[PDB]
Design an enzyme around this catalytic site. Structure first.
Site, short mmCIF file in Angstrom:
data_model
loop_
_atom_site.label_atom_id
_atom_site.label_comp_id
_atom_site.label_asym_id
_atom_site.label_seq_id
_atom_site.Cartn_x
_atom_site.Cartn_y
_atom_site.Cartn_z
N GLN A 124 2.82 10.04 2.17
CA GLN A 124 4.14 9.46 2.10
C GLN A 124 4.95 10.02 0.97
O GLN A 124 6.17 9.90 1.02
CB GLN A 124 4.09 7.94 1.98
CG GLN A 124 3.50 7.27 3.19
CD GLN A 124 3.61 5.76 3.13
OE1 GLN A 124 2.72 5.08 2.65
NE2 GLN A 124 4.73 5.24 3.61
N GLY A 163 0.86 -1.15 0.00
CA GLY A 163 0.00 0.00 0.00
C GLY A 163 0.90 1.20 0.00
O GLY A 163 2.10 1.08 0.27
N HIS A 187 -3.91 0.65 7.86
CA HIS A 187 -2.55 1.19 7.94
C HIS A 187 -2.46 2.42 7.06
O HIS A 187 -1.94 3.45 7.51
CB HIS A 187 -1.53 0.11 7.51
CG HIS A 187 -0.12 0.61 7.37
ND1 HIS A 187 0.92 0.10 8.13
CD2 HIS A 187 0.44 1.53 6.55
CE1 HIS A 187 2.04 0.72 7.81
NE2 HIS A 187 1.78 1.59 6.85
N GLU A 188 -2.97 2.33 5.81
CA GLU A 188 -2.99 3.50 4.94
C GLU A 188 -3.91 4.58 5.44
O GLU A 188 -3.56 5.78 5.34
CB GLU A 188 -3.42 3.15 3.52
CG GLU A 188 -2.55 2.11 2.83
CD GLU A 188 -1.06 2.23 3.11
OE1 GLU A 188 -0.47 3.33 3.24
OE2 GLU A 188 -0.47 1.17 3.17
N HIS A 219 -2.23 6.89 7.90
CA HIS A 219 -1.35 7.91 7.24
C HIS A 219 -2.13 9.18 6.92
O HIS A 219 -1.60 10.28 7.04
CB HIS A 219 -0.69 7.40 5.93
CG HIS A 219 0.53 6.57 6.14
ND1 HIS A 219 1.67 7.08 6.74
CD2 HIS A 219 0.83 5.31 5.78
CE1 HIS A 219 2.61 6.15 6.77
NE2 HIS A 219 2.12 5.06 6.21
N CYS A 233 6.80 -0.14 7.25
CA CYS A 233 6.39 1.13 6.62
C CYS A 233 7.53 1.53 5.74
O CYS A 233 8.71 1.42 6.11
CB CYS A 233 6.12 2.18 7.71
SG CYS A 233 5.25 3.61 7.39
N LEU A 234 7.22 2.04 4.57
CA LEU A 234 8.28 2.51 3.67
C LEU A 234 8.88 3.84 4.17
O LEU A 234 10.04 4.17 3.86
CB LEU A 234 7.73 2.67 2.27
CG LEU A 234 7.08 1.39 1.75
CD1 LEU A 234 6.19 1.67 0.54
CD2 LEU A 234 8.14 0.35 1.46
#
Ligand SMILES: CSCC[C@H](NC=O)C(=O)N[C@@H](C)C(=O)O
Ligand SMILES: CSCC[C@H](NC=O)C(=O)N[C@@H](C)C(=O)O
Ligand code: NA
Ligand code: NA
Ligand code: NA
Ligand code: NA
Lengths: 168, 168
Positions: A51, A46, A141-142, A145, A99-100
Site C-alpha cells: 500500500q 492495519g 485482509h492484510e 495485499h 481499505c485505505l
C-alpha cells in the site's frame, strides 16, 4: 515519515510481494516505524507494505480502540514479516471492511472466523498466534495485499458495497 | 433543475423501478428536462432516473462528443421510458465504464456487442432501435440501474477496477 498510500488501480497493489530478508536491521525498523506512523495518520487498523509501494511481505496492525469498529476488541499492535496463514476451521463470518487504498468505501466480506498466522517480528523473533473474529479478519485482509488481492474481488453480496456515509 | 445524484450504498439504487405511465405529460417532460440538465452538469453520457432517487423506468443518454470516451461515435440524445432490451447475438465485448453514483472509479465490463432496445420517447412515440458497441453499452448500463444493478457486480477481472487518475 508518513508515506503516501497508493490507491486501487495502481499495478503495484496487484503484485505478489517477495519475502523480507533484513530482519533485525535498522532499515527494516525504520520502514516499520513509517508504516505505524502512516497507518496512524490514515486511521487504519492495519496496513500492508504494498500500500505504500514497497514490495515486501510485511504488515502492521492493531489498536487499543477503534472509532470505526467500536465493538471490536483490542488487537495487539503488531508488525509481521513473511506472514503465513492457515484456517483452523471452515467456518466463515461476514463483516464490514474498508481499505485505505479505496477511500470512502466499504462492503461485507466473508472471512475465516478462526486462523493461525506465523511470521517474524522486525527484530527477528518468531511470531505464531491463533486469532479469531476481527483480529483474524484484519490479518486476512492484510495478507491479501501481499498476494495482489483487494476486498472487492471477495464481495458476494453487492448490495452491501457502497460509500461509508451513505450505507444503510 | 439539476438534481442530486445519489451514490452507491443508497438502497434506492437497488430497487426494481415501476413503469412510466404519464407519457406526454408536462410532469414527465419536466423530469426529463431535469435529467438532461443533471447528466450535463455531471458530464455523463447516460443517466438513469433511480440515480436521482426517482423510482421509474426512465433513462437519458447520448452526446455529440465525449471527452471521457474520445474514440466513441456520437450516440443520439435520447430519453427512453419503459425500456426493454434484447441481445442480437451472444458476442460480448469488454470496455471501460464508470458511474456517477460511484465517482472516481472505473472497471472493464463485458457487455453484449449488439442489442435491440424498445420503449417510448417522453411524448409517447414508440422507439425501437438496434445498437452496437458503445451505444449498446450505454443502454445496457442504464438498463441495469432500472433493475437494481450496478457495474461492480459484473466485473470479471478485478485487476481493471480502480481510480480514474491512477488506472494504467
Ligand atoms: C477490518 S479489515 C480492514 C483493514 C484495513 N487495512 C488495510 O490494508 C483498514 O484499516 N481499513 C480501514 C480503512 C477500515 O476498515 O475502515
Ligand atoms: C459507458 S457506460 C457508462 C454510462 C454512465 N451513466 C450511468 O448511469 C456514465 O455516464 N458514466 C460516466 C461517468 C463514465 O463512464 O465516465
Ligand atoms: Na492481482
Ligand atoms: Na470505508
Ligand atoms: Na439489487
Ligand atoms: Na470514472
Amino acid at each position: 515519515m508518513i508515506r503516501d498510500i497508493i490507491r486501487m488501480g495502481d499495478k503495484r497493489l496487484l503484485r505478489v510481494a517477495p519475502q523480507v530478508t533484513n530482519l533485525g536491521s535498522a532499515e527494516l525498523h525504520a520502514l516499520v516505524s513509517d508504516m505505524f506512523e502512516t497507518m496512524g495518520a490514515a486511521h487504519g487498523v492495519g496496513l500492508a507494505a504494498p500500500q505504500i509501494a514497497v514490495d515486501l511481505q510485511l504488515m502492521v496492525f492493531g489498536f487499543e480502540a477503534s472509532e470505526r469498529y467500536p465493538e471490536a476488541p483490542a488487537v495487539p499492535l503488531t508488525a509481521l514479516a513473511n506472514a503465513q496463514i492457515e484456517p483452523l476451521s471452515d467456518e466463515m463470518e461476514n463483516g464490514w471492511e474498508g481499505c485505505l487504498s479505496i477511500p470512502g468505501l466499504r462492503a461485507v466480506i466473508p472471512r475465516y472466523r478462526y486462523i493461525r498466522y506465523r511470521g517474524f517480528a522486525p527484530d527477528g523473533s518468531p511470531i505464531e498466534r491463533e486469532a479469531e473474529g476481527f483480529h483474524a479478519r484484519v490479518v486476512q485482509h492484510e495478507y491479501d495485499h501481499l498476494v495482489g488481492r483487494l476486498y472487492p474481488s471477495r464481495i458476494e453480496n453487492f448490495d452491501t458495497f457502497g460509500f461509508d456515509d451513505v450505507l444503510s
